[PDB]
Design a protein that fits this description.
mainly alpha, 0% strand, binds the ligand Cc1cc(N2CCOCC2)cc2[nH]c(-c3c(NC[C@@H](O)c4cccc(Cl)c4)cc[nH]c3=O)nc12, bromodomain, Histone Acetyltransferase, Chain A, small molecule ligand, transcription, 7 helices
Amino acid sequence: KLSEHLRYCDSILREMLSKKHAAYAWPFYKPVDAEALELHDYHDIIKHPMDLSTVKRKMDGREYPDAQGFAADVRLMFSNCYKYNPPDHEVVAMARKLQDVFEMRFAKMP
Ligand SMILES: Cc1cc(N2CCOCC2)cc2[nH]c(-c3c(NC[C@@H](O)c4cccc(Cl)c4)cc[nH]c3=O)nc12
């Protein structure tokens, strides 16, 4: 059941990275580059950064013991965005749209 669950998780990650969702997913493809984005305090506020490329690296590396560990990293990526940004920020709206996809797919895991 454990490897079966992670294969389903790997499929969620594929979907989140697919062109269908790119209009809102793209800000989450890569780690936040605080210098390049001029968010120079980002790592003072966000102590555990996360992004979809890091989830992929960890999934490929078999670092997730279960689907719950996968889900916690994905929710950490959304919560970092809700924590750092003002609630009316463009990127918060994009995070919510992507989280709507994640939560639905994750809940439908057989
Ligand atoms: C530009 C900018 C300004 C500020 N200010 C903080 C102080 O309060 C006023 C606002 C916070 C930001 N947070 C992020 C951010 C990301 N950005 C990608 C960027 O390519 C991007 C992509 C889509 C829309 C936008 Cl608007 C920017 C990606 C993931 N998580 C993030 O949190 N960008 C911010």
